[PDB]
Structures are given as C-alpha cells and as structure tokens.
Amino acid sequence: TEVIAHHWAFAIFLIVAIGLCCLMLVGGWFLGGRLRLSAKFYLVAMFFVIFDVEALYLFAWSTSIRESGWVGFVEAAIFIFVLLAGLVYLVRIGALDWTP
C-alpha cells in the first residue's frame, strides 16, 4: 500500500514524459503552415565494452563489500590487478593514443 503507489507514480511519470514529448513534437509539426571511417573508433568502443563488463564485476562487488571479508577484498584486488595490467598493456603498446 505504498510501493504500489510508487510504481503507479513511476508509470505515470514515464507515460506522461513520452506523451509530453509526443505532443510537443506534433505541436511543432502541426503549426506553421565507397568509403570507411576508421578502425580506432571501433577499437575504443571495444575498450569501452570490455572494461564495462569488467566494471560489471566491480558493480556487483560494491554492493557486498562488507558481507565479504578480507578474502573477498583479496580476490577483487587481484581482479583489479588483472584489469590494470590489461590497461597498462594497452597504454604501453600504443593502441590507446589517438595522434590525429
């Protein structure tokens, strides 16, 4: 009898936000009378994807930080060490600088 009201508020918020944008767009509408980009952009998107999925393990670690003891801290520390080893490998090879 409170979370149902909160879910209803979320629903009307979403529905009336999209409805406001729709009515705004149609009120603007009603009145008045062979190449290739690159490969480094794909590489930086792939860096974002892989480090975001490793950041997912950090996301799930951050909620259970206290309930897992020092052994969980050690495991997340060696996880982050592997992550930073990959990042510093990427830094040192030269695949991370842009140089336009």
Partner: protein, 192 residues
C-alpha cells in the same frame, strides 16, 4: 493600415485589409504568435566580401535562423549560392540587406555584379550606405521586430487563409521628416 499578401520577384501582391477587422480568441493568439516571433529572432549572417567586420564587431547554423543578412556584393557567381541558402531556410523568413551593395548595385554597375538582392529574392529591411554602423543594424533589428509584430500569418495549414500578410508600414523618412528638416545648425568640420 493597408496590407499586402502573397498567396499560392514575379509573384503578385495587391492591397487588402486585415482579417482582424470584422473571433477575439484568434486576435489574441495571432498577437501572441507575432510577439513570440518578434522577441526571438535568430540571424544568419551570410559570409561575403566586406560588411563582415561590421557584422563581426556588432556583437549560427543555417536552417534554424529565420532572418538572413545579405551584406556583401551580389555577384553572378555568388547569386546561386544566395538563392540556394535562401531556399534552404524555412518559412517564416525575413531578409535584411546591409550596405549599398545589397540594396542596389552598390557603386558597382558592372557586368559581374547583380544589381541588388531584390533581383532574385525579396528583401524585408534595407540598410543604406557603405559600411553601415552596427547601431544601424540594431535599429534595423527594431524595424523588422515591429514589422514582424504587425503581420497576419496563418497559424496552421489545416484551417485558415493560406497567405501571409505583410504590413504597409509608414516609411521611416516621412516619420523622421520633422526631426530631420528641423535641424538648424551643425558642428563645423574643423574640430573634433
């Protein structure tokens, strides 16, 4: 005052009377629309020869600006660019012709100069003289602001007359005639 309309340089315009002289809701709504078009004006300062530094020092993507400042000389090779940029803009659109080069031939009556912007697109507001001061441009902004404040344009393309109404405003030379003729003495040019 009387009004001219354009309905669908070679177009036809004749003299009519405004439809507000006859729905009081439409009269307030049209006034609010004209007010909103008045106080919010985005210019498109066209890049041309040498009124640039007068629009540079006065204070801009195309197709969002409802006002176009044609400043420099209109040449035979640049006039299609002017026409293409004018048709790129969306109605309502207004034109300010800066300098003599845009009002007329502007000291160039020669083969490679188009004699004014009026030859291909209409011009709403003119500013005379080789390079006008930015205050003259800002006064022309006042002039076009009040001209926009008195129009009668269609609100929508479903119901209403499908023709914009321009106002036959009183000219500035007759309005300023008393203040200009009633000038007795001036400062002599031997001092500063």
């Amino acid at each position: 005052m009387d009004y001219t309309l354009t309905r669908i340089p070679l177009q036809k315009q004749e003299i009519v009377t405004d439809p507000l002289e006859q729905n009081v809701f439409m009269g307030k709504l049209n006034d609010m629309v004209n007010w909103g078009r008045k106080n919010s004006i985005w210019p498109y300062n066209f890049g041309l020869s040498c009124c640039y530094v007068e629009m540079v020092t006065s204070f801009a993507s195309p197709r969002q600006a409802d006002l176009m400042v044609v400043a420099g000389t209109c040449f035979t090779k640049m006039a299609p660019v002017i026409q293409r940029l004018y048709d790129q803009m969306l109605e309502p659109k207004w034109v300010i012709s800066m300098g003599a080069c845009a009002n007329s031939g502007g000291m160039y009556d020669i083969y490679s100069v188009v004699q004014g912007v009026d030859k291909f697109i209409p011009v709403d507001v003119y500013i005379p003289g080789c390079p006008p001061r930015p205050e003259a441009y800002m006064q022309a902004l006042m002039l076009l602001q009040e001209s926009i404040g008195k129009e009668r344009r269609p609100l929508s393309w479903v119901v209403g007359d499908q023709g914009v109404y321009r106002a036959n405003m009183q000219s500035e030379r007759e309005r300023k005639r008393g203040e200009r003729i009633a000038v007795t003495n001036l400062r002599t040019p031997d001092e500063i």
